[PDB]
With several copies, the nearest count.
Chain A
Amino acid sequence: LVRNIPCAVTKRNNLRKALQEYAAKFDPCQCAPCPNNGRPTLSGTECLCVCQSGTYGENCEKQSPDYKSNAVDGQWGCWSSWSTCDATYKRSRTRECNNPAPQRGGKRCEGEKRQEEDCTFSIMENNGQPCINDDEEMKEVDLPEIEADSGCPQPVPPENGFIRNEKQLYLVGEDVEISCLTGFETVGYQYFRCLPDGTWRQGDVECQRTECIKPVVQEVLTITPFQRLYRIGESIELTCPKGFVVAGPSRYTCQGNSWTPPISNSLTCEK
């Protein structure tokens, strides 16, 4: 029920922990068994017996003429302590169900004798619990800031460029450094100066092409991949070395403009 309050998740997990401990401390398992298979119950620090119908007196000590049954029902003993983590890092604990032992046809204990928990270990330094709520997730879809500081938004880099030091908002006079993707190299002034007006002072920089990346292909291969990057000038063989027949040209080479072949298509050989 700890569901719609400030810090609801924190207090909920605290109260789970709490209820564990509290059970452990005040479970009626630690009472002496009630007579006439009454149920012990532990209100605070006194055990009270709840009597079966046909048993009466303050602690069920005496029984009506019809309560001939002498069967002793096997109420649970207290859980043993958690065992040391096993070969699968599970701890387990067991309660014999001996308190009293079922006798003369008395019922066996209903709950499972044994419980198992994974050993799970807290390694971070503890500041104390944060206040955490069920509302505390939002995506990209969060609202923009007012940005009244008017510090510049992240600029659009040149094509084949990327922003080295991405930030959501740049203070006035921050350098944002453009850099070029693998095929490309910054020639010029790669830096934009965020002006107090929020204009960028677009730097005199362009990413020339120096390299060509190993091309995408329509096939599992139809290629020999000598390199990840092939210099401007070098060449490549799209090839189907056996059985399959070429359905496209073979030799291709890096011009700095672009790949001469089609990007969308390859030899489409039969493999």
Chain B
Amino acid sequence: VGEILSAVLSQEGINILTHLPKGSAEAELMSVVPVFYVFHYLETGNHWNIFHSDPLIEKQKLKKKLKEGMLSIMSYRNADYSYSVWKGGSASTWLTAFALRVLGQVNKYVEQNQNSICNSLLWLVENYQLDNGSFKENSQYQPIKLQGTLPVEARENSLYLTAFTVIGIRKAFDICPLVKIDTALIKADNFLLENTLPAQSTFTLAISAYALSLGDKTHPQFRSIVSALKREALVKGNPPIYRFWKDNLQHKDSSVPNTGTARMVETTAYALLTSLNLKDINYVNPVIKWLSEEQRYGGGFYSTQDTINAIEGLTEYSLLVKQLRLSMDIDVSYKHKGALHNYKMTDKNFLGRPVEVLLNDDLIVSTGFGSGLATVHVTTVVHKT
């Protein structure tokens, strides 16, 4: 795996566990949503194997607060499985996709009634899909800037919203894979792949890159958009020590956390998430180094989106680093005969001695679940007339 650049939330993530009042005007949502993410982060690591100090170890109480959160958010579900900013508010597709994202993320840890997910997904598809402009938003009358970003408004607002909704669906369709939801993903991914490439804004480019990374990681259009994003990147150092993305100069004013720094962090975290999904650790590392230096984006996070996406990205990166840890006992065995060799591959002993495979058998190489990544090569040497 190479350099495991290690970055973590402080125990001051008690700030997120013990978040600002659960008040009206969706303040409840801001309070509880981050708790899912922080629970996931703690799950994805030693944090509930060990705290050296200031322990958040009472994962039982944390899970209680988590499910009380999931209750509070399910409260926001209207009659016909839309979500709304208010119990009686205008049905928001944005909010609904956000909820769906949350619920999909958490369903790996708390089982929840998937029928509601199916119904809200097919609601979002059938009522608000339209061609070229998927998941077009029903008027919420205002951007709730505390919860939404402030997108770019004139153009690619629809590319933003399609990206957001595709992300949510990709996070939730895995737990209700109804066929028309897949058809809707085909539609939305195709529209993103076609519309995104001449991106006006790095923010939109980033988010849509992410959304497609959830989808066909290997589509040529996707790889083009990636190759763009990778060039919007800004760096320091001859080999980049830090890498990040900024647009519209929303960076001159980074002294205090604000909408500009919020957006910059958002688009960076999307880029990062993307990369992770590409599994491009060498790329990722200087982005984790940037994201972990609070000062470079004004100290704290501002709004929800930046914060959640940053926590997500650190979670994923942790995950990835674990998955890459080489620990792979590789069986090689002939097909019709006994075992031939057992390479006990480990980061202490990553090198497989060349083994002679001179018998005429068809040759099998296999490994368990194991861990990490290896490559096995057989060379065939023969004399041809």
Evaluate contact between A85 and B223: CB separation under 8 angstroms. Answer: no
Residues in chain A near residue B301, CB distance under 8 A? 120-121, 123
Contacts of A220 in B (CB 8 A): 131-132
Given contacts A125-B7, A130-B295, A182-B219, contact A88 B146 (CB under 8 A): yes
With A16-B255, A145-B239, A167-B282 given, is the CB distance from A123 to B295 under 8 Å? no
Give the nearest-CB partner of B220 in chain A.
Answer: A181
Cβ contacts under 8 Å, B27 to chain A: 87-89
B242 partner residues in chain A, CB cutoff 8 A = 136
In the complex, whether A138 has a CB less than 8 A from a CB of chain B is: yes
Given contacts A120-B256, A138-B235, contact A125 B292 (CB under 8 A): yes
> Does B375 lie at the interface of the complex (its beta carbon under 8 Å from any beta carbon of A)?
yes
Contact A177 B236 (CB under 8 A): no
Is the Cβ of A123 less than 8 Å from the Cβ of B216? Answer: no
Determine if B216 and A191 form an interchain contact, defined as CB atoms under 8 angstroms apart: no
Contacts of A84 in B (CB 8 A): 21
Q: A120-B256, A130-B296, A220-B131 in contact; A182/B375 too (CB < 8 A)?
A: no
Give the nearest-CB partner of A213 in chain B.
Answer: B219
Chain A residues, Cβ within 8 Å of B194: 216
Query: Is B13 at the interface (CB under 8 A from chain A)?
Result: yes
- Between A118, A213, A227, the greatest number of chain B beta carbons within 10 A of the residue's beta carbon is seen for A118
A139 part of interface (Cβ distance < 8 Å): yes
Q: In the complex, are the beta carbons of B302 and A120 less than 8 A apart? A: yes
B110 contacts A by Cβ under 8 Å: no
Please report the total number of B residues contacting A with Cβ < 8 Å: 61
Known contacts A118-B302, A120-B301; is A142 also within 8 Å of B16 by CB? no
Instruction: Decide: B257 and A214 in contact? CB cutoff 8 A.
Output: no
A166 contacts the other chain (Cβ, under 8 Å)? yes
The proximity string for A residues 87-104 relative to B, scoring 1 for CB distances below 8 Å and 0 otherwise, is: 111000000000000000
Q: Which of B12, B187, B375 contacts A123 (CB 8 A)?
A: B12
Interface residue ranges of B295-330 to A (CB < 8 Å): 295-296, 298-302, 307, 310-311
The answer to whether B16 and A123 touch across the interface, beta carbons within 8 angstroms, is yes
Q: Give the A interface residue count (CB, 8 A).
A: 50
* Chain A 123-164 interface 0/1 with B at a Cβ cutoff of 8 Å (1 = within): 111110110100011111011010000000000000000100
Question: A255 at the A/B interface (Cβ < 8 Å)?
Answer: no
Known contacts being A124-B292, A220-B131, A228-B186, is A177 close to B375, with CB within 8 Å? Answer: yes
Q: Across the interface, do B300 and A120 meet the contact criterion of CB distance under 8 Å?
A: yes
Of A10, A84, A119, chain B has the most CB atoms within 10 Å of the CB of A119
Max chain B Cβ within 10 angstroms of own Cβ: one of A9, A87, A136, A143: A87
Contact of A10 with B295 at beta-carbon distance under 8 Å, contacts A16-B255, A125-B8, A220-B132 already known: yes
Nearest-Cβ distance from residue A115 to partner chain B, whole angstroms: 13
Q: Does B348 contact A (CB under 8 A)?
A: no
Cβ-defined partner of B257 (8 Å) among A120, A181, A227: A120
**Chain A residues, Cβ within 8 Å of B15:** 121, 123
Contacts known (A123-B15, A125-B9); A162 close to B218, Cβ less than 8 A? yes
Q: When A125-B9, A136-B242 are in contact, do A88 and B295 touch as well, CB less than 8 Å?
A: no
Known contacts A87-B25, A145-B239; is-contact A122 B299 (Cβ 8 Å): yes
Indicate which residue in A9, A122, A166 contacts B280 across the interface (CB closer than 8 Å): A166
- The answer to whether A138 touches B236 (Cβ under 8 A) is yes
Q: How far is the CB of A184 from chain B (nearest CB, A)?
A: 9
Q: In the complex the two chains form, is B10's CB within 8 Å of A137's CB?
A: no
Set of chain B residues within 8 Å of A177, measured between Cβ atoms = 375
Question: In this assembly, does B24 line the interface, its C-beta being within 8 Å of a C-beta of chain A?
Answer: yes
Question: CB distance B255 to A181 under 8 Å?
Answer: no
Instruction: Write out the residue numbers on chain A whose beta carbons fall within 8 Å of the beta carbon of B298.
Output: 120
Partner of A214, one of B186, B231, B239, B246: B186
Q: Which residues of B contact A127 (CB under 8 A)?
A: 292-293
Residues on A with C-beta less than 8 A from B239 are 145, 168
Which residues of chain A are near B223, meaning CB under 8 Å?
A: 162, 181
B46 within 8 A of A: no
Q: Is A262 an interface residue (CB 8 A)?
A: no
* Closest partner residue, chain B, to A134 (CB atom): B252
B337 at the interface (CB under 8 A from A): no
In the assembled complex, which residues on chain A have CB atoms less than 8 Å from the CB atom of B238?
Answer: 142-143, 145
- Could you mark each residue 224-250 of chain A with 1 if its beta carbon is under 8 Å from any beta carbon of chain B, else 0? 010110000000000000000000000
Tell me the A residues contacting B by CB distance below 8 Å. Answer: 9-10, 12-13, 16, 84-89, 118-127, 129-130, 132, 136-140, 142-143, 145, 162, 166-168, 175, 177, 179, 181-182, 191, 213-214, 216, 220-221, 225, 227-228
Can you offer 22 A-B residue contacts whose CB atoms are under 8 A?
A13-B295, A85-B21, A86-B23, A88-B27, A120-B256, A120-B299, A120-B302, A122-B12, A122-B300, A123-B10, A123-B15, A124-B292, A125-B7, A125-B10, A127-B293, A137-B246, A142-B238, A179-B218, A181-B220, A225-B187, A227-B186, A228-B216
Q: A122-B12, A130-B296, A167-B282 are in contact. List 6 more A-B contacts (CB 8 A).
A: A120-B299, A123-B16, A139-B235, A213-B219, A214-B190, A228-B189
Residues of chain B having any CB pair with chain A under 8 Å: 7-10, 12-13, 15-16, 20-21, 23-25, 27, 30, 131-132, 146, 183, 186-187, 189-190, 194, 216, 218-220, 223, 231, 233-236, 238-239, 242, 246, 255-258, 280, 282-283, 291-296, 298-302, 307, 310-311, 375, 377
